[PDB]
Symmetry: C3
Subunit: 295 residues, 3 copies
């Protein structure tokens, strides 16, 4: 796209503020930003806020979201679809033109770990170029295992294809399949979907801890066979809904856009890989590490 040549828009922080007991404002950009998805491989990603996946959004069950998209793409329209919300797609997930903003309002009345993404046709194009992320809606009543959890992180799986190539996006195998982590609390890592960062800078935990991961597989196209090496999931809540409660799972099948809360105990010091067990994907990047130490 001639108007994206040489474009590399610096990442912009997510803006969020609570405006009432049940109402939140969120402001995101659509922007075009170079991301290093594998060593020496730059992808001029279509993004929210210069991250791909986009920035983590966390709201409470029952919060109405008043969402603004500021479209910094000089020539492509963009839009936002939160899977968390009840909305009219044809009124509320509509396009925002280059250099314009739009504001849309809709309720998040279901707990869980939801994909969000650009909803502009062709949606496959906008997602595959980078316009995906997660919104967590925290359950009013928690999870029944909350008191057991020592530490928590967010991990998101996505694929990367040949650049902006619709034939590849539709018909081709992924070039890379990757994990990223998005921060929940100060100090947590906040990374993009790449083949290396979570190997070189593993997530951290302590021996004996029960870990919760909020996970989503945003695709665009593949399903995920999510597994942590050296443990078993003690508890799993499909889509992060507390009702959908499995136990003792070695691996969690996630559809494209599928989420989960998963919990597991790390009993011994060491480095624990986190994989999709579809090992062709793992080979192509989708292995993160969790380093577990006595401190």
């Amino acid at each position: 796209i001639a108007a994206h040549k040489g474009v590399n828009q610096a990442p912009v922080p997510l803006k969020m503020e609570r405006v009432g007991p049940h109402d939140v404002h969120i402001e995101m950009t659509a922007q075009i930003t170079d991301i290093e998805i594998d060593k020496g491989k730059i992808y001029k990603a279509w993004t929210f806020n210069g991250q791909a996946p986009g920035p983590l959004v966390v709201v409470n069950e029952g919060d109405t979201i008043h969402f603004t998209l500021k479209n910094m793409d000089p020539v492509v329209p963009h839009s936002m679809d939160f899977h968390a919300v009840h909305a009219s797609p044809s009124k509320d997930f509509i396009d925002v033109m280059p250099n314009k903003s739009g504001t849309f309002t809709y309720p998040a009345n279901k707990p869980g770990v939801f994909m969000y993404h650009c909803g502009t046709k062709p949606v496959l194009q906008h997602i595959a170029n980078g316009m995906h992320g997660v919104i967590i809606v925290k359950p009013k009543n928690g999870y029944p295992t909350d008191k057991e959890v020592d530490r928590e992180y967010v991990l998101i799986q996505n694929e990367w294809y040949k650049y902006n190539d619709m034939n590849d996006f539709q018909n081709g195998v992924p070039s890379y399949v990757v994990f990223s982590s998005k921060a929940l609390k100060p100090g947590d890592p906040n990374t993009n979907g790449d083949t290396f960062t979570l190997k070189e800078k593993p997530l951290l935990a302590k021996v004996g801890e029960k870990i919760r991961l909020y996970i989503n597989n945003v695709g665009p196209n593949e399903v995920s066979s999510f597994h942590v090496v050296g443990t078993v999931f003690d508890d799993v809540y499909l889509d992060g809904n507390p009702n959908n409660h499995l136990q003792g799972m070695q691996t969690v099948m996630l559809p494209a856009s599928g989420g989960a809360v998963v919990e597991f105990t790390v009993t011994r010091p060491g480095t624990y890989p986190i994989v999709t067990h579809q090992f062709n994907h793992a080979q192509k990047g989708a292995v993160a590490m969790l380093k577990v130490t006595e401190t």
Copy 2:
């Protein structure tokens, strides 16, 4: 197949009648019928009754089915396998020769949303050419959410490949992935698996309604990441068995031949896409629309 050149057998209505409180007669054809699966693309489908997927069958839990297949294919044998039933495959899902009929009897003692398909070797060939459909077995005791449901429809996902090409069917990506709808009540649409009809003539609903969809992904080969845009599934029953009850799902993972009952509320007027969230498939046809109006 030289004997299928120029063949285009007109669709024949499904014949069904109840013959006792727990016994139903069904009569289907196997026939070769031209179907427009994408604009300007005709597939000379191997079909039940000139529809692909085939006609909807609905029975009650506990019904014994006395099924007749009238094989109108001039040269290929065909057969019928209902996933709903307990049967001996080697006695009851056997071939019916060209220009012959066969009758097979077997019980449907499990509720749910079951694939049916031709069972003739190579089964991949017979399914991929079009010989798939759904049989719904209604639970004796309903679903616990029955009283909440305002409107219901059936949707079926399938793929289309290069015509009658076994190499493609085994090794190739689908050319098209599609939804169709099959009528439950008078006035409901009854369509074939194509890339357009459910976009151009959306399913209809009213603002505020709880919608039930009976869904099945008949494949032949892909899994489905089933999602309705702008809502969340309030309730999901895997395979349509009331016991397999999930809540609050954004997306439902369906294996090949996998079914579900899914229920969701449409809160605002607008057009709501229905997708497989494996967006390469959606791009290749698998997007239906639900138009929600104040009336």
Copy 3:
């Protein structure tokens, strides 16, 4: 690999013995063994004990496993990862060099049907070449349906690719997809992953029996849409954990490495195919047979 030319190491029995009420010794080899995966097609598999998948391991919930790997590969390191166990991957699933042994100890405190596999980088290589299998951990309290089960078997699904070809393993469709059976009791068949043996020598059962299958899809790469023709699963326990209890499933979605216990009734004499309902895979080998007789 020049050091594997002409190598065909005879299969070696699994060695296992109980050493205390809650402790078991297991001794396995890593070895290079020719296996006929389709008629006339030999794969010089990387294996545990000269079987691919490897030998069945069965332990009780709560058993600590003291595992020895004797590496007979003349030049490639190998290792063992049991999904059943809590272990430090970087200490306990480490490599054993050619012509050496290693012993690792770790607890199996979760019931179910777990994949095991070599964990040596690149893991995709070691799994795809043949180094996968199942470990069953029997639940302390059984399954609630135990008293209904008449007969049980183990079935494992895997893929085969072009020989030792990492490009194919990562980017290519499987050449073959196959079932094998591993013995639970004397007289049960014990087979390797091939396209024919379970068609030519079907598993055996009696009319009216409730059958339990312990199943796992070891991949490396595909998901499985597991179905038995002519029946419906009465009960399914995901990953073989008794808590994860579905009913009335026509087909069970297994991720890569995903397991299940599934139970179904065979009501009539006949031959019952067992498939993955992803019919491209079935075409490429993944159909086993269950022959049901009056005796």
